[PDB]
Amino acid sequence: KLKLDAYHLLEASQSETAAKSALSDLNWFSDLADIYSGQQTMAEMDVALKAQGEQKLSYPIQGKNI
Amino acid sequence: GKIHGAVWRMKHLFATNFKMVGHPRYAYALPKNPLLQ
Q: Which of B18, B30, B37 is nearest residue A19 as measured by Cβ atoms?
């Protein structure tokens, strides 16, 4: 096992298409993107629950408010 | 004596290579490198 690890590192050094890291196939960038977008949206729509209390409004209307 | 000479050369030419974990004719049976892609 030790010899094979040495040989793998050596042949990776000798080859040009060698991986820039020994951290095999990464497949957890999608989940990161999804949770990032999810937290962003959840904040964006936990804002406008607070920023739209909207007690009442005052619209100027011809004939009545003027 | 022939066998002695053969092993005496095998030592010097195989034991410090880092490239010969076994014989090259049987490298198909080895596991695959995770770093190559």
A: B37
